[PDB]
Short mmCIF file of N, CA and C in Angstrom, two decimals:
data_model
loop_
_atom_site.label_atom_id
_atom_site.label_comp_id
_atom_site.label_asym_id
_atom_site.label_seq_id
_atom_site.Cartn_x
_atom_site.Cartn_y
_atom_site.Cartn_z
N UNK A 236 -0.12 -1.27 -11.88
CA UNK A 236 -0.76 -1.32 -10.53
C UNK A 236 -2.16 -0.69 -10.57
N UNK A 237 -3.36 -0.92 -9.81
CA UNK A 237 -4.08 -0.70 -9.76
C UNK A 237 -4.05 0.64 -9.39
N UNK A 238 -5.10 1.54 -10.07
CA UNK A 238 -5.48 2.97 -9.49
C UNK A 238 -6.17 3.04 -7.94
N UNK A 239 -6.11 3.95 -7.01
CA UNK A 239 -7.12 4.06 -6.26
C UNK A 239 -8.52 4.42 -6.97
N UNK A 240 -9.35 3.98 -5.84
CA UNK A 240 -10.93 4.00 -6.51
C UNK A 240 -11.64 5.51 -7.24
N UNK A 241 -12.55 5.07 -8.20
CA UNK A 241 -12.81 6.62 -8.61
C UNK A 241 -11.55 7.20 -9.46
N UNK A 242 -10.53 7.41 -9.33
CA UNK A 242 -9.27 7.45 -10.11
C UNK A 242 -9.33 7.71 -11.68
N UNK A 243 -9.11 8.43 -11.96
CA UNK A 243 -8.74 8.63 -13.90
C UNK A 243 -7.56 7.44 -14.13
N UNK A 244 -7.53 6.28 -14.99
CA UNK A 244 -6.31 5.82 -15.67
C UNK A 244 -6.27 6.06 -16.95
N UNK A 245 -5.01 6.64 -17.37
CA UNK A 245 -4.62 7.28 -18.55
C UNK A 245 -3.37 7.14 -18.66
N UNK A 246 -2.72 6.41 -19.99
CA UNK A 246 -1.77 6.19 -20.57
C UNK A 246 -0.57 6.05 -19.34
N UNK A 247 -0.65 5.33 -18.02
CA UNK A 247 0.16 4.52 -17.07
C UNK A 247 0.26 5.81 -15.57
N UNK A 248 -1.04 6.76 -15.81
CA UNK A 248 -0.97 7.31 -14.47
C UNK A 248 -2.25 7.52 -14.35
N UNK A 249 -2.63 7.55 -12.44
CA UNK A 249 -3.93 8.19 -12.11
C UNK A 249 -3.89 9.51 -11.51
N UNK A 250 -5.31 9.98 -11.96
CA UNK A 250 -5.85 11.17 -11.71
C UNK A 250 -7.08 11.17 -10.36
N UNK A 251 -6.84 11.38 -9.69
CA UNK A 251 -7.93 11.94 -8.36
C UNK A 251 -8.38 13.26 -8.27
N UNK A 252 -9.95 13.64 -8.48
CA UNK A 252 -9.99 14.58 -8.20
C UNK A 252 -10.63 15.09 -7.09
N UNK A 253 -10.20 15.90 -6.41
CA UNK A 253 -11.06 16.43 -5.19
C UNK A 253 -11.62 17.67 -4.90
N UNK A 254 -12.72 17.53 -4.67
CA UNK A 254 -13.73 18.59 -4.68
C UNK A 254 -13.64 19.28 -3.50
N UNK A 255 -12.70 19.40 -2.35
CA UNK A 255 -12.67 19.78 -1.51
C UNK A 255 -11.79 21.19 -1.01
N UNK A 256 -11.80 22.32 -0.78
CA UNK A 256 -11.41 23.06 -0.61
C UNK A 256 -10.26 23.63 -0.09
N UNK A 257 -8.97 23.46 -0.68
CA UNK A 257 -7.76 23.92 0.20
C UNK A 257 -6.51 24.41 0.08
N UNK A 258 -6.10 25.03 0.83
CA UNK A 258 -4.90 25.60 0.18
C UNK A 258 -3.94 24.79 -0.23
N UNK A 259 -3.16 25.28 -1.18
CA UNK A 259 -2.05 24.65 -2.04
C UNK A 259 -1.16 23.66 -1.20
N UNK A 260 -0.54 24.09 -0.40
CA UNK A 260 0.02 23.24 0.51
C UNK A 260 -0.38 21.72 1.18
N UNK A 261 -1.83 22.60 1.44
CA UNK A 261 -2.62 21.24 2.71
C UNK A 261 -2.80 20.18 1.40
N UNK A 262 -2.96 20.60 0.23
CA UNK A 262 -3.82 19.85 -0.85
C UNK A 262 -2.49 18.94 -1.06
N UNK A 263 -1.45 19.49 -1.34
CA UNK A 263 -0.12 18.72 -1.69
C UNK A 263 0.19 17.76 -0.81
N UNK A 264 -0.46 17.87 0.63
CA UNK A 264 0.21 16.85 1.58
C UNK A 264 -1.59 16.01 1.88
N UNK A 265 -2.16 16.20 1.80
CA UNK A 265 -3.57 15.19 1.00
C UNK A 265 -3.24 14.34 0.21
N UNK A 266 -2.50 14.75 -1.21
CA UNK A 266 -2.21 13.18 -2.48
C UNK A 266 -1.18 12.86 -1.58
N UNK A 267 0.17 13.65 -1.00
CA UNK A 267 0.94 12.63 -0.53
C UNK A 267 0.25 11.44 0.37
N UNK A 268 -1.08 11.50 1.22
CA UNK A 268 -1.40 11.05 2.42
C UNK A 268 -2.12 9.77 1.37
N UNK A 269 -2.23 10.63 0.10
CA UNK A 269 -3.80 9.08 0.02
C UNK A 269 -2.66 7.87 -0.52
N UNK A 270 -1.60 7.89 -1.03
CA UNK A 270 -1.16 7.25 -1.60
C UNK A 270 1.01 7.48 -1.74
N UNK A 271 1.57 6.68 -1.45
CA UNK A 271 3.17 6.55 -1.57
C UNK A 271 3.80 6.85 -2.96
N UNK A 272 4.30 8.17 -3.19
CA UNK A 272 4.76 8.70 -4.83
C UNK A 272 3.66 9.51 -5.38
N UNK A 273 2.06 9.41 -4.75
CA UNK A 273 1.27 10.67 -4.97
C UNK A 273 1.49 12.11 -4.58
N UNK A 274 1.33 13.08 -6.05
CA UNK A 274 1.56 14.66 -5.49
C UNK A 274 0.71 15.10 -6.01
N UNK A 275 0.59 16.25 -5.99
CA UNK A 275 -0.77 17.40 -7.25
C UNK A 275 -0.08 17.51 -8.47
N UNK A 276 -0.96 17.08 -9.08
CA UNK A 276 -0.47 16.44 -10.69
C UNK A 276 -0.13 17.43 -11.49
N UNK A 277 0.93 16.76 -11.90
CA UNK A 277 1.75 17.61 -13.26
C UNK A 277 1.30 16.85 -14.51
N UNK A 278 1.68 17.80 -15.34
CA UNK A 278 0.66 17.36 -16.46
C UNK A 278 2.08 18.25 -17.97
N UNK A 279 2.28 16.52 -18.53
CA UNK A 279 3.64 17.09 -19.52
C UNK A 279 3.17 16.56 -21.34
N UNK A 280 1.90 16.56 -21.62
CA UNK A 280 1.63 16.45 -22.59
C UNK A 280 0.34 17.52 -23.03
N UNK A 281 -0.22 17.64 -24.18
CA UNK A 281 -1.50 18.13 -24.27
C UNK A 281 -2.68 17.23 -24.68
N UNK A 282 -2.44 15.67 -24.65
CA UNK A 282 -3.06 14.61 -24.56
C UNK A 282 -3.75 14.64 -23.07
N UNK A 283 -2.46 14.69 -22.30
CA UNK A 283 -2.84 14.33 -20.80
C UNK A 283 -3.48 15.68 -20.20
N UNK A 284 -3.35 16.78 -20.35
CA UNK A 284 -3.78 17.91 -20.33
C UNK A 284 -5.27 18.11 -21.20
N UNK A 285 -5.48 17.31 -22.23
CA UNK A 285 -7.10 16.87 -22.32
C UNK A 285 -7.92 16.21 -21.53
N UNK A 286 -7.21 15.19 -21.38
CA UNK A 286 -7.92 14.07 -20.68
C UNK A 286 -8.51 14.46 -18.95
N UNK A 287 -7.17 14.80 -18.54
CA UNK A 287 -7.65 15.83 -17.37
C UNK A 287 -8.84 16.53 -17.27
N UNK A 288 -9.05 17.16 -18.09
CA UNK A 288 -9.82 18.37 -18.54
C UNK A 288 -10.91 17.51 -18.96
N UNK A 289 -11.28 16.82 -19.88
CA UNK A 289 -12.77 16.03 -20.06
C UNK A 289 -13.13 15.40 -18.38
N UNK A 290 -11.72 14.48 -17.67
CA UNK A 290 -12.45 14.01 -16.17
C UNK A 290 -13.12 15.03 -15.55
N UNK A 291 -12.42 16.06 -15.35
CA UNK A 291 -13.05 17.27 -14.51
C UNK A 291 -14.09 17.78 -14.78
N UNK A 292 -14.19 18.05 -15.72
CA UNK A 292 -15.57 18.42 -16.54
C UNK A 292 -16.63 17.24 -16.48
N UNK A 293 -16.66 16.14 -16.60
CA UNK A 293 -17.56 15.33 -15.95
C UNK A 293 -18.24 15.11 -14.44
N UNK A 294 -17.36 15.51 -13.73
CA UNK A 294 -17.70 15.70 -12.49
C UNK A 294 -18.77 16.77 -12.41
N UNK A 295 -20.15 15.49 -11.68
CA UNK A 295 -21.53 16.14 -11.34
C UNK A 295 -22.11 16.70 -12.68
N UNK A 296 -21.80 16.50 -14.02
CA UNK A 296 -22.30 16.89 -14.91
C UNK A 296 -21.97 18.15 -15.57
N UNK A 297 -20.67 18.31 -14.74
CA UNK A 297 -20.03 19.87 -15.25
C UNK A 297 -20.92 21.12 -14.07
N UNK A 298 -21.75 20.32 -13.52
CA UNK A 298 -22.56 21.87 -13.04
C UNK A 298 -21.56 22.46 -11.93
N UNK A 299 -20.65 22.01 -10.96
CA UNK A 299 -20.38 22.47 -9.64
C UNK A 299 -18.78 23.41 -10.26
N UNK A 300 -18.39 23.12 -11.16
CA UNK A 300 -16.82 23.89 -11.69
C UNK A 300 -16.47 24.98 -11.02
N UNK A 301 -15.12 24.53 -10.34
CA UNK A 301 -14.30 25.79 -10.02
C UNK A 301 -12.82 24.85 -10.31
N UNK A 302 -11.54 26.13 -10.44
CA UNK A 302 -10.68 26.21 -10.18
C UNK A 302 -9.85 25.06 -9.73
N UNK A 303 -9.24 24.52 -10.38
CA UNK A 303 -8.08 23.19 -9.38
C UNK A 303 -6.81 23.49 -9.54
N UNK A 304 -6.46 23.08 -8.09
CA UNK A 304 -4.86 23.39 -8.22
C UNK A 304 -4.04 22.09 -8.44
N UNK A 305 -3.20 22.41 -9.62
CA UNK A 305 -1.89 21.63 -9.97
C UNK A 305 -1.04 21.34 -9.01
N UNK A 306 0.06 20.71 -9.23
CA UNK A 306 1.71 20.95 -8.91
C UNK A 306 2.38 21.69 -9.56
N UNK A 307 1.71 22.54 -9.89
CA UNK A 307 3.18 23.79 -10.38
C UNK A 307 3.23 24.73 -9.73
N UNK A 308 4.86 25.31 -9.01
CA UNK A 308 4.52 26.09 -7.66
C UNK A 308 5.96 27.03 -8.53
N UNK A 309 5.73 28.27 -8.00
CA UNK A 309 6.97 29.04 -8.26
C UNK A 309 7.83 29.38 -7.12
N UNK A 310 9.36 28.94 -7.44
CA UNK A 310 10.11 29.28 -5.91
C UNK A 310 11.39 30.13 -6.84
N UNK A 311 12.07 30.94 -6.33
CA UNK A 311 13.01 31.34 -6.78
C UNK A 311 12.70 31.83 -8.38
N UNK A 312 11.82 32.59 -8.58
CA UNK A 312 11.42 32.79 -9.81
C UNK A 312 11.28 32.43 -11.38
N UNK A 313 11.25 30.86 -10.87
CA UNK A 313 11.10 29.68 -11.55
C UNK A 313 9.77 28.95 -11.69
N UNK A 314 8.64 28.53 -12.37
CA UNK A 314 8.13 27.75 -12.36
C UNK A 314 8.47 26.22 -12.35
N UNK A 315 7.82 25.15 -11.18
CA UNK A 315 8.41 23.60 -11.26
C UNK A 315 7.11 22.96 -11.14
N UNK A 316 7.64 21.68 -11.29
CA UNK A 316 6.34 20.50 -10.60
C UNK A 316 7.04 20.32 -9.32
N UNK A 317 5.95 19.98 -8.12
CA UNK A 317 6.32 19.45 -6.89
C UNK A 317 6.41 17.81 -7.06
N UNK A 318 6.26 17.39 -7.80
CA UNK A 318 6.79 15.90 -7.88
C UNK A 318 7.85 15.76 -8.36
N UNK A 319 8.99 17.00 -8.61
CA UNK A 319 10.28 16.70 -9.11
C UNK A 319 10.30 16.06 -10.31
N UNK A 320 9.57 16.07 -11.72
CA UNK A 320 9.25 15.82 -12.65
C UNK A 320 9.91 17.08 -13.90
N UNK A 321 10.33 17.20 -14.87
CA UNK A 321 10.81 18.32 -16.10
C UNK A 321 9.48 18.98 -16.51
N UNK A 322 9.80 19.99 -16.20
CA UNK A 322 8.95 20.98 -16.51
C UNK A 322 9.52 21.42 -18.25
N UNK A 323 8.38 20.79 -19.43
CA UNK A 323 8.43 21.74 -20.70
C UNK A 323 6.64 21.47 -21.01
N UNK A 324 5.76 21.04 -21.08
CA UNK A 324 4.69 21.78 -21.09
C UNK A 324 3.68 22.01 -20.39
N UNK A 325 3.57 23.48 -20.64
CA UNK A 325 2.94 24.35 -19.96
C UNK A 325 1.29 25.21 -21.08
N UNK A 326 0.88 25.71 -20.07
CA UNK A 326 -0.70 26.33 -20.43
C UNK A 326 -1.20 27.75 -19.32
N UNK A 327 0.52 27.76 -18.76
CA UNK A 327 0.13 28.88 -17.62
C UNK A 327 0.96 30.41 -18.92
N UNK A 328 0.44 31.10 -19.03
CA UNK A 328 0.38 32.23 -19.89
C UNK A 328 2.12 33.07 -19.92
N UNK A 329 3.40 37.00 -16.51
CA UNK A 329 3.57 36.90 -14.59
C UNK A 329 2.78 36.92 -14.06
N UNK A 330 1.28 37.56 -13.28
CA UNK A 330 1.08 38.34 -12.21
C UNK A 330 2.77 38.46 -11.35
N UNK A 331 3.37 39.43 -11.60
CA UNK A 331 4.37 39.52 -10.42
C UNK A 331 3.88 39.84 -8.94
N UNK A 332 2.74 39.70 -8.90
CA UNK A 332 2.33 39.62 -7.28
C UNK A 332 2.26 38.55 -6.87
N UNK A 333 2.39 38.36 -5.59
CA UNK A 333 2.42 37.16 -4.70
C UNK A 333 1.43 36.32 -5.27
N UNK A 334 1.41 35.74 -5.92
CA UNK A 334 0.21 34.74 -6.77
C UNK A 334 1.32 33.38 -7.73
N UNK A 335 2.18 32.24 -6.57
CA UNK A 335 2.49 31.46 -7.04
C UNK A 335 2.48 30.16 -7.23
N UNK A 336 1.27 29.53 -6.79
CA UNK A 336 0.81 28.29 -7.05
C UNK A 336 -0.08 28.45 -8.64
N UNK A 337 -0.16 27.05 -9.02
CA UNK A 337 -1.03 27.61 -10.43
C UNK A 337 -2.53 26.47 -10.54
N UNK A 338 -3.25 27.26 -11.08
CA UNK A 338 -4.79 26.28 -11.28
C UNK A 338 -4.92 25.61 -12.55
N UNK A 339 -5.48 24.87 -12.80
CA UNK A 339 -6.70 24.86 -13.72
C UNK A 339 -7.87 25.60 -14.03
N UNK A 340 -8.13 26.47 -15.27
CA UNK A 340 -8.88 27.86 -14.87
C UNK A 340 -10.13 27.05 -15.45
N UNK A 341 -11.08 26.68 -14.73
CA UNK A 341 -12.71 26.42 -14.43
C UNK A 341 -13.65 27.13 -16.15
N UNK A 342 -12.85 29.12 -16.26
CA UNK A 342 -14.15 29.74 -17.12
C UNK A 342 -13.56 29.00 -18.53
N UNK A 343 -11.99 28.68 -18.55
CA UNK A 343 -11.73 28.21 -20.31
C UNK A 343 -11.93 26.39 -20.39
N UNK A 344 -12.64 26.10 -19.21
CA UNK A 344 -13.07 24.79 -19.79
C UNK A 344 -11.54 24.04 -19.34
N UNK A 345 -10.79 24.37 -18.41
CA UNK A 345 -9.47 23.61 -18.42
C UNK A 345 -8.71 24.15 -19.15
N UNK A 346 -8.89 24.96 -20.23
CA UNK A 346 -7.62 24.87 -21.47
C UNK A 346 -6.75 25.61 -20.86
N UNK A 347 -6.89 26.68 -20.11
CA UNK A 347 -5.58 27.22 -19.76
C UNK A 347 -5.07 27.28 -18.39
N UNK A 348 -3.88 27.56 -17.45
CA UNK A 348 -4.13 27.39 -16.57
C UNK A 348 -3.73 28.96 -15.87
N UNK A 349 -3.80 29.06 -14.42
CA UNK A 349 -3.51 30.53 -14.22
C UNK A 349 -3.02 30.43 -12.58
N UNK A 350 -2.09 31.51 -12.35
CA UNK A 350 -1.70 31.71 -10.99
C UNK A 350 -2.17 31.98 -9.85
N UNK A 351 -2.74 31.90 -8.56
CA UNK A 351 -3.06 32.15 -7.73
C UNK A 351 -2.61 32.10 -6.54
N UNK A 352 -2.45 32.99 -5.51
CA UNK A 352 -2.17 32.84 -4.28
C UNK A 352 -2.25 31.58 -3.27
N UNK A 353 -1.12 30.92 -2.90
CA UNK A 353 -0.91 29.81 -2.18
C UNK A 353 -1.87 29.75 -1.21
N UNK A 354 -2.63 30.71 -0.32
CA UNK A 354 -3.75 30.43 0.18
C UNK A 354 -4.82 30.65 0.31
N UNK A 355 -5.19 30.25 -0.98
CA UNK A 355 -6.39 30.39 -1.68
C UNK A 355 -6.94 29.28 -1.83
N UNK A 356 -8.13 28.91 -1.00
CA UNK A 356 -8.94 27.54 -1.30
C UNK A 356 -9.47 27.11 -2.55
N UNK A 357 -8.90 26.17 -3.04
CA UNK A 357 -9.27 25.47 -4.36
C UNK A 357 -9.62 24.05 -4.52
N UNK A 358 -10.33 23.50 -4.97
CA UNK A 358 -10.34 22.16 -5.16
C UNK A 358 -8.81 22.20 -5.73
N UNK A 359 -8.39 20.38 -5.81
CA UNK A 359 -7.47 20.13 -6.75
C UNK A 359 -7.20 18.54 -7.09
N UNK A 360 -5.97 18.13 -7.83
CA UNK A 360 -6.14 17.17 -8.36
C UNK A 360 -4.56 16.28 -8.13
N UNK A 361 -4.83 15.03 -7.77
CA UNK A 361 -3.43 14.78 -7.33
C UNK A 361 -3.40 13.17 -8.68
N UNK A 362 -2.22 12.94 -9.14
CA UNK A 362 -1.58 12.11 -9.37
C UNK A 362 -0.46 11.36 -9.20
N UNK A 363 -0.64 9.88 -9.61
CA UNK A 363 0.42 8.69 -9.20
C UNK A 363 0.54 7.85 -10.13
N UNK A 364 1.95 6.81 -10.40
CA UNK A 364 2.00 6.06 -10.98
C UNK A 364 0.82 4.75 -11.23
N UNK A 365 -0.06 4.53 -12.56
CA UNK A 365 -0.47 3.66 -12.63
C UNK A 365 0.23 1.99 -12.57
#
């Protein structure tokens, strides 16, 4: 199926990224809105976890970089994806403080990712079946 416009396609899914500022939540119900089976993207390879990472980094030439939030949320002292997807790879490193949504960390270039407080304005990035 076709990607929405602007869209990353990579090996049978798209990537959207949005530059827009918001908490974890509002951002999660944003991919649900743009698209039917869209969430904030989980990411289960280190292929796809590149590729990610070069789109983002292209955006505006790399100059504007901050922070994007995933689908990986901690409930019950578990890390998951909110798309109900198996969680085995990961790039998130506790903070045992209230800090359980997770980013894309902006200073390592993408490579790693890190925890932050659910309402904490972040860009972020949603994916869907290609």
């Amino acid at each position: 199926d076709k990607c929405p416009k602007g869209w990353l396609d990579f090996r049978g899914n798209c990537y959207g990224y949005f530059r827009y500022e918001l908490p974890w939540k509002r951002a999660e119900a944003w991919c649900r809105s743009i698209r039917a089976g869209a969430h904030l993207a989980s990411i289960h390879t280190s292929e796809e976890h590149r590729a990610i990472a070069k789109f983002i980094s292209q955006y505006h030439h790399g100059e504007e970089e901050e922070d994007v939030w995933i689908g990986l949320f901690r409930w019950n002292s578990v890390w998951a994806w909110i798309d109900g997807s198996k969680k085995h790879y990961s790039a998130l490193d506790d903070y045992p403080k209230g800090k359980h949504c997770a980013v894309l960390d902006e200073s390592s270039g993408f490579l790693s990712w890190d925890n932050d407080s659910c309402g904490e304005r972040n860009a972020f990035i949603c994916k869907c079946t290609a």
